Structures are given as structure tokens and as C-alpha cells.
Ligand binder design. Sequence first.
Ligand SMILES: [Mg+2]
Ligand SMILES: [Mg+2]
Ligand SMILES: [Mg+2]
Ligand SMILES: [Mg+2]
Ligand SMILES: [Mg+2]
Ligand SMILES: [Mg+2]
Ligand SMILES: [Mg+2]
Ligand SMILES: [Mg+2]
Ligand SMILES: [Mg+2]
Ligand SMILES: [Mg+2]
Ligand SMILES: [Mg+2]
Ligand SMILES: [Mg+2]
Ligand SMILES: [Mg+2]
Ligand SMILES: [Mg+2]
Ligand SMILES: [Mg+2]
Ligand SMILES: [Mg+2]
Ligand SMILES: [Mg+2]
Ligand SMILES: [Mg+2]
Lengths: 210, 147, 51
Amino acid sequence: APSRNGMILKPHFHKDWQRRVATWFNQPARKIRRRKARQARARRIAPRPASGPLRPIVRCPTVRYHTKVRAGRGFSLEELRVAGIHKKVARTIGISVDPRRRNKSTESLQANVQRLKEYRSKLVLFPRKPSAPKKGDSSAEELKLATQLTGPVMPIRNVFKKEKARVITEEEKNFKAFASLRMARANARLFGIRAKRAKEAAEQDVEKKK
Amino acid sequence: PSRLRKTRKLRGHVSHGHGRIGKHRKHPGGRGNAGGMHHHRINFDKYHPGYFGKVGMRHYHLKRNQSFCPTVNLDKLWTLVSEQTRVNAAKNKTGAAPIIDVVRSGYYKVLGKGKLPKQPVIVKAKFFSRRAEEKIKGVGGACVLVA
Amino acid sequence: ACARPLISVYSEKGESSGKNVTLPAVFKAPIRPDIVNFVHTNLRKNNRQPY
RNA sequence: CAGUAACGGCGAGUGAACAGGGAAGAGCCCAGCGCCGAAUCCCCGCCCCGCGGCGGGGCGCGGGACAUGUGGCGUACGGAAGACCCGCUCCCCGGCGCCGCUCGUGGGGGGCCCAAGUCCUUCUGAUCGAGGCCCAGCCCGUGGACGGUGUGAGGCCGGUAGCGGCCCCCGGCGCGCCGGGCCCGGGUCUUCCCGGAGUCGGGUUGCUUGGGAAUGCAGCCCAAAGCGGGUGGUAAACUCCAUCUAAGGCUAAAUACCGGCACGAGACCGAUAGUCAACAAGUACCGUAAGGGAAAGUUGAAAAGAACUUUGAAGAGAGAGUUCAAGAGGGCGUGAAACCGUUAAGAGGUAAACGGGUGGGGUCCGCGCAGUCCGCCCGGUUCAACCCGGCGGCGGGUCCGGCCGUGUCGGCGGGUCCCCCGACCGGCGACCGGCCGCCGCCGGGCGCAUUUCCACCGCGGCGGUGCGCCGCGACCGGCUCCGGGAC
RNA sequence: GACGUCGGCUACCCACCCGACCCGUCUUGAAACACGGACCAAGGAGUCUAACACGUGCGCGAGUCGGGGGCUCGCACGAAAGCCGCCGUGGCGCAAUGAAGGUGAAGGCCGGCGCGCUCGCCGGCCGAGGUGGGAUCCCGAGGCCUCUCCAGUCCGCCGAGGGCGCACCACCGGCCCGUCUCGCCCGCCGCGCCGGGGAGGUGGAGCACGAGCGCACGUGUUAGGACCCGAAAGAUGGUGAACU
RNA sequence: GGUAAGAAGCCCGGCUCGCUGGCGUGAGCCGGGCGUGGAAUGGAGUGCCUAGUGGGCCACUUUUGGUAAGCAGAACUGGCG
RNA sequence: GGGAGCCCGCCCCCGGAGCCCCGCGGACGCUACGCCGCGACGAGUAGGAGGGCCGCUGCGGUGAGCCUUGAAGCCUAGGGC
Ligand SMILES: [Mg+2]
Ligand SMILES: [Mg+2]
Ligand SMILES: [Mg+2]
Ligand SMILES: [Mg+2]
Ligand SMILES: [Mg+2]
Ligand SMILES: [Mg+2]
Ligand SMILES: [Mg+2]
Ligand SMILES: [Mg+2]
Ligand SMILES: [Mg+2]
Ligand SMILES: [Mg+2]
Ligand SMILES: [Mg+2]
Ligand SMILES: [Mg+2]
Ligand SMILES: [Mg+2]
Ligand SMILES: [Mg+2]
Ligand SMILES: [Mg+2]
Ligand SMILES: [Mg+2]
Ligand SMILES: [Mg+2]
Ligand SMILES: [Mg+2]
């Protein structure tokens, strides 16, 4: 029963909710088990990074963000072809590869190719056998480091470019942002109807000819 | 703490603070929001006007990302940049007019609320309002549209 | 910035040596028994098993 | 995201998905299309190895399956074959043994072990109690958890801590050998090839969903195509765009775990509680059956569980004995109330019982063989007074000197964080070294009109009181009256 | 007055005078010929989670936060505690108004350019308006005096009177969004069924120099078993013709 | 049963008006001058949460129905509750 | 500070004026969540609020706490608050 201006509330407790109550007393044990598994997996691959394969540079959809850069699932086949790495070979050296990712922009392609080249530059390819075959690094850069790479490999940072103070001219001052936005919205709304009217006028002229 | 609660002071009292004429029954008026139209209508109509009825158009698949457009007023615009940038203004005898990017700070729309200090600025934003643009032009700045 | 004196360190057998350490500013922080009691009472419940 | 978009006698109510941040992260295989002499697979015989999760090789015109299609290449991320640009040739399976004992800091399982008081008195039935023992005490301590032992034990015992030890089994990672299988690339160009049908889809009806001219699943009917098909959250036509390739299949990790095996813990309950079940509990018992389902822990440190004498047929007693205690005697620790017997006292014709006020009798309590209660001031053996030395402390300012320390000014000397001297000021309890005055203690003097303890005759001055029963006087405050005079 | 005498308000028993009907509950009304009640012991009924609203305390503050995750211990005390380019993905708040397409919070003064046209355009100045009541603060004549008359800087109390005026209240103005009426002009990449501006009413959970965030405590309303005990019912799955 | 018994009141001077008007009104803005406004008693104003209640009864007086009622039903005030 | 009054000077400090005020330091009184002085008031069902050195159980600290020379529990015509 309501009483002198309370909120109208609709709790979702009409089912047998007490049957399916999920407690969280397992949380510290779960965290400890996850940490132990992570440490064991890191120890299993002694020189390889604990984080895993390198991830590409990805920009987010959904204009809400539209500007953040995060790690992708894997490098596209076009990026591998430009960088010169076989798709089947790449997964064996620690490079994430997925075949679903398209490539629309040149900037992202070039950034990912540069990232792949930078990763290849700082890569220590151990020989398959104690004897050193082709493409294996020298023994000098093998005893120098054999430890894990803590954290993500080449961490992704959303970097912005600082703009120097300008010398603003009269052309920028005369620009009307609000009017331009309103005109652009009106043009976008009326493009199709104006095209229809122009077509109708053209048909009127053609029927006047005959 | 049940020690500090009212139930400790009600020991020895027959009705336990719920009256002896009208007892504490299960649900004298009904469960939940029952009776919004009958026998509870006065409360709903004098505390929640517009509860009953339907108004407006439906939007089946609504996505909040499309309608995402944070707004910032001109009252607090120099706060997005470091204080030394504002200190390096009305100075250097050149009219530097430092550029302020609101999309970097997480804003798309610039509104005209507040008073803008007399210093030229370069403001880059997804959208601008008429009053904000008027204030910026009057101060001596320029509005730049960024996609 | 309250007045922080110098505290003399002591060796393994007493007999304070020549080394001195200025009092850290933490020891000049305000004493709030109510805040300490509140924090202690609320934090001591976190190591409690359900029954 | 989000109690949101949406659904709902648009009422009650119901109610997702995308993106974002994380945990984990692993990709692949067929049919078809085509090229290789079926190049493929199963079974039975013999030989060699090992055979306790029956495999590998060889020898068999020994059988069978398979052309109504096995195997090799190859699957949407394109593929196959030639052309000729580039650098070159180790992965897996089954055994034979071998060194490193492989993180809870020696991987898993099991077994045997590793420090120090029963020290001196003293309680007790029995100490693990109490006092003391080269420093909280005697020794160890990387061991001061726990349990048992006649109480309450770090050192009596088992254990506890330890990158402590030894003895067996198992698991896993690596080395040399044997049997083997394996002649296995990348980029460009050229020529061909490239798709799962009663399926999609449409109508329908029923169920379901937030999905609303129908989200998904369906019985029935219709029923395809290949620049095709599906999707783009309002039904339809036209028109461009964006995104996948359905109707074939496999795959660990982050996830769940009121059953099972073996462990750890608790601000949980403590025998009408906690599981029904602390115990011969799903037992006794009830119902034809499906099923229903209890109550019930405690002697004592140790049975040392009462020998023996006596009355009684015996159950039962009286003695005796054990034990610290049977005033613990086999449903025996402590033993309340309701209720009952007896003993002692009181009382009793308006049922008993109750509140206020007294009286009488008992129970013990506190005195007392007067209780006249003390505590200060006054009268009737050494040191204070006063000096010398030592020790410690207090306060002060010329800030006497330095450190310490707050704000500004100076040297920019190293936005915020540090160095040097000088000046002013707050000199702020942030410290000293000297000076002054004072206080206390110790050691020397100071021998007795001062000084200090004990006991008395003074009730002399002050304060709180009297062992109990009392009485009297004066003063004040508030009342009830009485006798006079005068207007 | 002191070896069978003292004091013991309360409790042990008895007697006397006055008062005095059995408790709990429904009820206008109970001692009721209204209901429950032989007696005693033990157990026994407003709890917990979640969502709100207000009040209170604490920390930070136009910011606040720890959800989840990660790094330190092999868990005695610990499933604690400490930390994070995770310090903020994200929530809440900082902006509201329309069904929506969308729009979106400051004006005033001074001089000039169009005819100051209560309208448009150029430069400078002040930067949340004004009125009334307003706790407190500022100035303050003068008085009170002081061992005698005068002069007199100072330490005071009162101080008529005059002001700046917190918070808050009431009113008059101003601004933002939707809508109605009357209208005059501005701009262009595309001169259009383009876009923008004014005045006067009205509708809004708004602005008008901010106050929230997190934790904890209490109260009140709910969903849950919901303070405890209580039905006549309904549904699902099984067992019985040893009576009849 | 409503009002009035003064400071939120009066008396002057000047501005504004797309209202109304022959001049005028009427309203709103600023400046200045005048204080115990009948008796007696009270310190007031304002904002949030908020339980219980929502079966009543009796009496003086007025009063409706009924022959009347310890009957049923109203008004003021006071009580029991 | 000067001029003077019904011959000049002093007219002094509490480590002492000794007090009904001592502005020089200040309780026997100061658990300032403490103490002290004035006045008025005291009904209560439903209900609300405050204080409990009222009572029970367990946890973190603290009583160099109590205890086999006797803990809890139980009984009591004993002494009290
Ligand atoms: Mg990760
Ligand atoms: Mg929300
Ligand atoms: Mg084939
Ligand atoms: Mg023991
Ligand atoms: Mg022990
Ligand atoms: Mg031992
Ligand atoms: Mg549509
Ligand atoms: Mg039981
Ligand atoms: Mg017994
Ligand atoms: Mg009833
Ligand atoms: Mg009745
Ligand atoms: Mg009664
Ligand atoms: Mg009965
Ligand atoms: Mg009880
Ligand atoms: Mg409420
Ligand atoms: Mg029931
Ligand atoms: Mg029914
Ligand atoms: Mg009543």
C-alpha cells in the first residue's frame, strides 16, 4: 500500500529466487586458483611472453567511443602479406592471426604492418636444435635474456597529437559552424525529395518537347 | 545492530506497536501496487501524475551509442586544458589562441552557458550551438568542426 | 607543517648511536578515535565465515 | 549496459540484446569439384619384440569389404597443375636403458625418526597449582598450535617448526641406442575448378519470446534459384548500398557442482538445541501399501563395584569395609519447581489470598560487661633555624652563544619539492652550555629555653558525632485560637 | 541504663482497623450467566536479503566510488590486509526540454553605422538583476567619568543615528526547451517546400556562481515464508476390491 | 458570522506606459518627511519524516420518525472511551 | 602635562594588603558528556521518543583480574543497596 509520496517500485522477486541465490564466498579462492594457474602457465613457457601472442591495433565501432584504440583478435591476412609473414608460420612464432577481419582503411593497415615489423625486429627466434640453423638468432642474444615478458606485448596506448597555437586568420573567424550544421542537416533530409522534384521538372520539359 | 533497534523496546507491550483495535494483518490493502485505479486512486493521482496511459512513439531496437553526445558549457572550458596553457594567454604579444579539443576530454557538443574570459580560443567539436559560437566569436576565437 | 623533532636510533644493546631521524609527518596527523573505531569495527567483519 | 529498448485486461507485472572493461584464448576436418593402375580398410596362419590400458614389422596367389567409391592432394582464409624468382633438407610413433628426485619452496602416495625441568620447597586424593632457581624467573625456541597424562603443562608423551634426515612405489620433463614412417617449401604469373532440396522461402495454425502486420520452434499445404540466397527490429513495390555463405562434422580454457572419496576452518548449536538420528537410527514401532517414524549422553582419578557378621523365603534392612567424597552404590555428576511424608513454631466459625498502619512472638545480625567516638592547635632520642661541600630540579631575561624552529626579504645559488649568511618579527614548552634566584636530598657541623616520638591532667579553642530511651530552653517559618485596649 | 537487657525500617508467623471482585482479550460498555486458563519446568513469535524516501555521523568534494580484475603468501592469526598508466571502463552528479525530427540556459551600460525603428550591425566597460524583511559586521555624534581648573593623545560601556548587507522567504524582471498569434529582416558551396533571428501569452520535474558521491546507523513503505499459529480448496505422481 | 482599530500607514516631488483618455486617467518605478494607533493575556514563525485511528457512547440545551423505549437519527458544548 | 586648593617631600611592593574583593596565581567545585543556582510543572489507553552503572550469549582489546587455601550452578527465618 502506498503512503504519502513514495516511489512506485516493482521488485523482481515474484519467482522462487531463493532457490537460485549465487553467493560469492568463492571469490578469494577463485582468484588464488587463477593466479596459481597463470603462474604455472607462465613457467611452462619459460622464455615466451606470459600474456601470449601479439595483438593488433583496433579502433572501436559505435560512435559513442569512436576514438579509443584497443587490442584486436589478430592481424588480417592482408597485413601479413604486406609484412611478408606466412599465415601458418605466424601462429607458431607468437603472432595472432584471424581470417575474418577486413581492411577498409590504409592507415590501420600501415599501422599494423609497422607494428608487425617492430615486433619482428625485437624477436629472439631460438634455434629448433642446439645447433643453430638458418633464421636463428646468435647465441649472444640468447643468454642475455630468457625471462618472461610481463604484461601485454607492446602495450596499446591511445596517443593524441598536440596542436601548436595558431595565427588565426579572418577566414576561420568568418566560418559559421551552427549555420553549416543546420544547412547540412537540411540537405541530408531533403536530398531525395529535391531529386524527385528535379526529375519531375525534367519529365515536364520532355513532355513539353513532344 | 538489532540492539539499537525498536524491537528491543517493545518487549512487554501486547500489540508490539501495531495497535490493538486494528491488528497487523497480512495485506489489508493488497499486494504491491494493487488498486491504482480502485481504492488507491487518490495516492496515485496526487503523488504520481501521469502514471496511467500511453504517450509517444515506440522505438523497437534502440541503441544508446548512436544518441551518445556529451555536452560541455563555456562556463568551464579552460578546465579541459592545463592551467599553464591559460597562463600563457594574454601574453607573448602574438595572440597565440591555444587550441582546445573537447573530443579529447570526452565531449561532443559545446553549449553556451556561462561567461567566457576575454581570450581568443580555438575550439574543435563535433557540434556547436548558436549562443556558444556567438560567445566564441565575440571573445575573438573561432569554431572548428571535426568529424 | 608542524614542528617535527629528531628521533635518535638505538643499537642492539640500547646506547643510542649518533644516527638521528627526523620525525615523519604521519606522527603529527590528527587523532580521531571515532574514525579509528568505525574503520576497525567495519573491517573486522571481513574475516568472518558464514553460518 | 539495465530494471533500459520492448512486452502487458499498457493493469498487476514481465523484460533482453549491442558496444565498452576483463578471465581465458586454438583452430580445424568432410561431401561435392577434380588428379593418382583401390594407390584403401578388416579378419585368420607363421616368425621377431614387448606383451596387467594386444601394438609394430616381415613372410602368406589365405579370405572378405570396396568402383552403388576406400585412401593421398585439397574446403571458402580460395584450391589444383605448369612456368621459373629465391634458401635449403628433421618431425613423429613403439621399445631398450641412463643421469638429474622435478617449487611451497623435494612433484604425488606410504613407512621410521630428529630440542628443552618431572629442578628445590609447598598445597592436594591426585598438579599440569603457588613461591623460587646466573636476565620472566632453570633450559629449548626456524619448535609459546593441539591432544592425552588422577586439575590450569613450551620443556612427561605423541606431535608442533625446519631449502630436516632415511627407506620404497608412482607420475612428469630430458639423454644414447634399436625398429621404423617421412624426398615433406615461400612469392609472382598463366590455365582450369569452386558448394550440402521436401532444404530455404511463402501461407497456416499451435506453443514460446522483450521481439511488437508475427522472436524462435513446429503439424499441414505450396515449394525454389544461382552476379543466387540470408540479414539490415513496421507490412509492400522500385532502387542502390553494407555484411555473411545456411540446410555436413570435431575441438581443451576461463564456467557449475546441497551426490561420492579425502582434508581444512568457524564471532555457528551445545542433548526439548544442532541433521530424524552425539547412543545397537532410517533402529524400535505403526499401516495391506505407497509410506510414517521416535525416546534415549554423564558413578568414580582408579571398580578400588561394598569381603565379612546379623534379621528376613526373598525383595529388602542393621553393622563393617573402599574412596577426598556413596551426603557419588550399576539410568549412580550437579539435583531447582510443581507435589508428598515427617519434625519445630504460629494460627484457625464469614473460602483462600492482597494493599496501607501498628502491635505481639521467633530467626539470627551489630554491639556492649560504658560505646562514651576521634582528628588538629594550646597549657602543664635527634635535628630544623644558620652555615660548608656535593647531587638533582624549577623559572627568568641581557637571547648571554650555538642548535631548533615559523612568515617575509637576499644569493636562482639545486609549477611543486632543497641549500648559505644577514635583518625583522611569532622566540612558538623544539634543545642545550654558562649566570642569577629558589626548592629538595645526602654528608659535616649546630648539645639543647629551639627541634622531634610515646603516655597522662586539662572536655581549654575548632570540626564531624552521641550505644539506646529521653526531657528542657531560646530563635525562626507556616497555621488554628484566646484576652485586651483605641478609631 | 546495661549480662538476659539494647537497635534491626526490609523479610518468618499471628492479630487488629480501614481499603480491597480474576487475570489477558474483543468491546461504547467485563468481576461477569463473554471467551483462554489444574499446577510446575524448558522452548516460543517483528528476523534476513533487495529496492526506495527522510533524518543523523564520517571521508573526499565538482567531483566521488570501488563493482569486477590484476600484483604481494606457502591461509596460524587470512579466505584478512596493502597497492594499481587498472583512479576509472562503468554507475551517480555536473543541463534541461519535446512524441520525435531536434534544440539547448546572460544579460546590462556607453559611443558609432541604418531613421536608435523598443529592430539589425560595429568597439569598450560591469560581469548572475531589482524591491521589502533580514542574524551578524562597519562608521558613529555624544554621554558616563576619572581627588580641584584647563589641555589631552589612550584602555573602556552605552551609544541616538547612518551603511555593506549571509542564509531564507514574498514579489517584480531576465534566460533555456515545446506550443500559439503578429510580423520585419539576415547568410550561403549548392538561392530552395533552405537555414537563423524579434515581440507578445502560455506549458516544463529547468538556469539564474554548484553539492554531490561512498560508507555506516535509525525510522517508514514494499517484494519476498515476511511477527507466530490456523482453513473449506486446487494440481502432479503413486498405493489399495484382506471390509464392502 | 465577516471586516477595521496604522510603518506592509499617511503627506509631498519627479519619471515610465504598444492600457484608457479632449485636456485626463489608472498602474508601476525612484527621492524626501512624519512612529507607542481600543482593553487585557501571550514569545513567535517555518520545514521534513511520522505511528495509531477511520465500530463509539452518555448528558444540559435545540430537534426529526415513532404511542413509547435503556429505540433510531442530527446541531453546540462537556464528559466516559 | 600645566596651573592650583578647602613650607617642602612622601602618597612605596601583596613572596606580603591579609582579606565580603585582591584586575599578581587561583577550588574542597573542574569524570566541562563535570559541577552549581534559580523558578514552574508532574493523569493516561492506542501510539511516538529518550535514558538504563537493567538482564543473556559470543567476538576484538583491557583488568601483572578471580579460582582445588575452591569456578559455574543450586538452597537460605542471614546483612543491605
Ligand atoms: Mg588476459
Ligand atoms: Mg541506472
Ligand atoms: Mg573422395
Ligand atoms: Mg591436559
Ligand atoms: Mg600443553
Ligand atoms: Mg618432546
Ligand atoms: Mg523498416
Ligand atoms: Mg535431538
Ligand atoms: Mg544424582
Ligand atoms: Mg473484531
Ligand atoms: Mg456488544
Ligand atoms: Mg477483564
Ligand atoms: Mg477451560
Ligand atoms: Mg524461557
Ligand atoms: Mg515513507
Ligand atoms: Mg497452513
Ligand atoms: Mg480453482
Ligand atoms: Mg476502544
